[PDB]
Curated annotation (Swiss-Prot):
Residues of the full protein shown: 869 to 1007 of 2193
Biological classification of the source: Viruses, Riboviria, Orthornavirae, Pisuviricota, Pisoniviricetes
Described purpose of this protein according to its UniProt entry: Cysteine protease that cleaves viral polyprotein and specific host proteins. It is responsible for the autocatalytic cleavage between the P1 and P2 regions, which is the first cleavage occurring in the polyprotein. Also cleaves the host translation initiation factor EIF4G1, in order to shut down the capped cellular mRNA translation. Inhibits the host nucleus-cytoplasm protein and RNA trafficking by cleaving host members of the nuclear pores. Counteracts stress granule formation probably by antagonizing its assembly or promoting its dissassembly.
Active site as annotated: 15 (for protease 2a activity), 33 (for protease 2a activity), 104 (for protease 2a activity)
Top-rank taxon: Viruses
UniProt protein name: Protease 2A
Organism: Coxsackievirus A16 (strain G-10)
Amino acid sequence: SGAIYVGNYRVVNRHLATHNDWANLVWEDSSRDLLVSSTTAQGCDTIARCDCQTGVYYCSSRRKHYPVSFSKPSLIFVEASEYYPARYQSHLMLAVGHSEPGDCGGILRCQHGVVGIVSTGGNGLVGFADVRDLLWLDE
Ligand SMILES: NC(=O)[C@H]1CCCN(C(=O)Cc2cccc(Cl)c2Cl)C1
Ligand SMILES: [Zn+2]
């Protein structure tokens, strides 16, 4: 579990969205596994605007923060699941690191702020859904 709270917005994994998120929907994209909903209270997470390829992520399955090197956002094939058929997930970044289902929602951060959230993983790898291109979250 996990989410990003910036201004009057809440960013979560699309496959974990609640009834409230769908009733206060701003934007959603199945190919990115993202959903953004409106909030009554102001959020104070800083979103990063960079091309950093190193950072630190939180892993709930180990109660630990781990440093990682990660790839540039791209189209990566994701195996069929209970939430989606077999497809290409866009804007995804991979790193060598531990993850298990339950770690989705964990935040990835560099020195400039929030880079993205855990969305896929396995085989000794972890996948992060990038958010640095969504400039409307700040304005
Ligand atoms: N983004 C997707 O399509 C997900 C949906 C849930 C299923 N999924 C996975 O990769 C499962 C998983 C295994 C090991 C580590 C992690 Cl963090 C995860 Cl999410 C694809
Ligand atoms: Zn950065």
